[PDB]
């Protein structure tokens, strides 16, 4: 029952990320990039709980 909206880049290494994309510092957000030709198990699904 928690929601994360912060886009702070995760630090996978020891050196600080310094707010620049590079080694061991990747942007935590990724896009679905849906296409109509996707498979049955990869198509979008509208989920309500």
């Amino acid at each position: 029952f928690e929601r994360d909206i912060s886009t702070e880049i995760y630090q996978a290494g020891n050196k600080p990320c310094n707010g620049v994309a590079g080694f061991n510092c990747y942007f935590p957000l990724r896009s679905y990039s849906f296409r109509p030709t996707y498979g049955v198990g990869h198509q979008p699904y509208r989920v309500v709980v």
């Binding site: 996978a12 020891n14 061991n24 296409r35 030709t37 996707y38 498979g39 198990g41």
Partner: protein, 596 residues
């Protein structure tokens, strides 16, 4: 934060981006393949350039991980396939000269033009003229002229390019810590880090030599039979114990012996089983053929298949204005997208070919959950060693009678079995020594054991020994006969076909034992054998996460190449070849030549 954790964190994003990027590249290529237009050329080129740039950038980023500090035997496998420094170790000039060499080789091979004598106007390419002449024409003069022209006008155009290619490939192999480029090709089968299942590149040569030696007795009987049959057609062209001429092998290079079936048939009054007229009679179409194939596939327990395959992929020739390639292609775009292209015509050849591709995509969808870098077969032989065997099993008379294409009134007589086995041997048995000696010659050239001045001088003994073929006209080192092949000009390994041929028969023993089939091995049907379907799927689903040795153990229970199934397939045939060869010399001599 361990190094393995960092590698996993990098690889997750790498796989996630690479899947989408390769999907885009694959759709761009498929659009051009199904629709040849000017815009599609640019789209495909841009997609390929973007994919190459992304792969190079990711490899440069991942070069910082030393391979020694990754455990779990899974992340390290992806890093090995990702690093792949290859020719990028050398300077940019040596990379662009390699690109130029490959481009010129491909262009020269593609532009192969032969002009008829006394008329410098009617010239012919490899197809459809030269191919038809090599496949059907039996005239000695025309075949010899075409063979000489093709090996003369093309060999010299690539011989210095071949020398430079060999030298620079040796340099690249040295820079990549390899003994030779042959080891660079053989590195696919290498297995390390697994106790009791390690594999080495050098052991492969001995393994293939032993199986070639054990195959040998099956080969010279067929060769003697073919020579005896050809003696009735060319009474003044073949020595009784000499080698067969190079351009009387059924085609231009002698790779396949199936072109002489119309002449080397022991029983010409017994037609083979061809039910193309049957499917013509019942108005069978492409949809009906695909439905019959699906009915065959569901009988072994394989799951259902998505509707997107039917909706997206085209399965009928459009003709008219829309020009598209008709080459049978199975596109695995990824992300649950699977497509197959065919220009389906009313012929049993297409029916047999579709068995390759449908099981091919069945294998492709098996390893969907695997990482993108591991969405391939454990080796280069596991990809469709089963896809070919289902096609071979689909030709059994039992299933042909079951589907209604063959009437039940077809009584089985042993005359048909011998003809079918001989026809199969004209495609599979005959090509094995030729492929082996070609691979050995290329390996020796890459290693350097064959001197520069004697590439062809050493080339013609194997022809006189391994395959029993003698040239009709002597050639010096100026000519380059091997350069006239598809694979040599495109820098492809030629052992893949031999390994796949070895692998396909090995699976058949286990498949028929699980199916509890009784009788000849070539009449074995895997229909209604869902246990065998589960057994094969258990190996198809592993993908690339496991070494090929483990997958080979999971089907037959071995760790080395096995040739006993090869003899089991042709066991009745070999005994009969022991009969009609009792009055003819079995073998050939290396001293006589047609040109004397």
């Amino acid at each position: 934060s361990t190094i393995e954790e960092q590698a996993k964190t990098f690889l997750d994003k790498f796989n996630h981006e690479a899947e989408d990027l390769f999907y885009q590249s694959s759709l761009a290529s498929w659009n051009y393949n199904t629709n040849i237009t000017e815009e599609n050329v640019q789209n495909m080129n841009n997609a390929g350039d973007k994919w190459s740039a992304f792969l190079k950038e990711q490899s440069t980023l991942a070069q910082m991980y030393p391979l020694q500090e990754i455990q779990n035997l899974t992340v390290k496998l992806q890093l090995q396939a990702l690093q792949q420094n290859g020719s990028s170790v050398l300077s940019e000039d040596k990379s662009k000269r390699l690109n130029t060499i490959l481009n010129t080789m491909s262009t020269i091979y593609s532009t192969g033009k032969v002009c008829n004598p006394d008329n410098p106007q009617e010239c012919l390419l490899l197809e459809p003229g030269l191919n038809e002449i090599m496949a059907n024409s039996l005239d000695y003069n025309e075949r010899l002229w075409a063979w000489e022209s093709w090996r003369s006008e093309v060999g010299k155009q690539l011989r210095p390019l071949y020398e430079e290619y060999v030298v620079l490939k040796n340099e690249m192999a040295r820079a990549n810590h390899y003994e030779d480029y042959g080891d660079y090709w053989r590195g696919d089968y290498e297995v390390n880090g697994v106790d009791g299942y390690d594999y080495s590149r050098g052991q492969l040569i001995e393994d293939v030599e032993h199986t070639f030696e054990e195959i040998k007795p099956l080969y010279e009987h067929l060769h003697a039979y073919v020579r005896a049959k050809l003696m009735n057609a060319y009474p003044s062209y073949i020595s009784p114990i000499g080698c067969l001429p190079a351009h009387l092998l059924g085609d231009m290079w002698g790779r396949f012996w199936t072109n002489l079936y119309s002449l080397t048939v022991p029983f010409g009054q017994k037609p083979n089983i061809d039910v193309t007229d049957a499917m013509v009679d019942q108005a069978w179409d492409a949809q009906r053929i695909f439905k019959e194939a699906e009915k065959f596939f569901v009988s072994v327990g394989l799951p259902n298949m998505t509707q997107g395959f039917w909706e997206n992929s085209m399965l009928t020739d459009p003709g008219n204005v829309q020009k598209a390639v008709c080459h049978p292609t199975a596109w695995d775009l990824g992300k649950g997208d699977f497509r197959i292209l065919m220009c389906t015509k009313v012929t049993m050849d297409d029916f047999l070919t579709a068995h390759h591709e449908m099981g091919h995509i069945q294998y492709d969808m098996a390893y969907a959950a695997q990482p993108f870098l591991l969405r391939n077969g454990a080796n280069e032989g596991f990809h469709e060693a089963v896809g070919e065997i289902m096609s071979l099993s689909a030709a059994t008379p039992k299933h042909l009678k079951s589907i209604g294409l063959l009437s039940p009134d077809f009584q089985e007589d042993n005359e048909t079995e011998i003809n079918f086995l001989l026809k199969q041997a004209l495609t599979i048995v005959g090509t094995l020594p030729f492929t082996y000696m070609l691979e050995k010659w290329r390996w020796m050239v890459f290693k350097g054991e064959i001197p520069k001045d004697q590439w062809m001088k050493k080339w013609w003994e194997m022809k006189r020994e391994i395959v029993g073929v003698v040239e009709p006209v002597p050639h010096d080192e100026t000519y380059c006969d091997p350069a006239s092949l598809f694979h040599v000009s495109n820098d492809y390994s030629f052992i893949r076909y031999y390994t796949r041929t070895l692998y396909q028969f090995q699976f058949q023993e286990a498949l028929c034992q699980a199916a509890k089939h009784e009788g000849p091995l070539h009449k074995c049907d895997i229909s209604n054998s869902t246990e065998a379907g589960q057994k094969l799927f258990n190996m198809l689903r592993l993908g690339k996460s496991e070494p090929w040795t483990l997958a080979l153990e999971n089907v037959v229970g071995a760790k080395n190449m096995n040739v006993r199934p090869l003899l089991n397939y042709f066991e009745p045939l070999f005994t009969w070849l022991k009969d009609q060869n009792k009055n003819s010399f079995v073998g050939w001599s290396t001293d006589w030549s047609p040109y004397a």
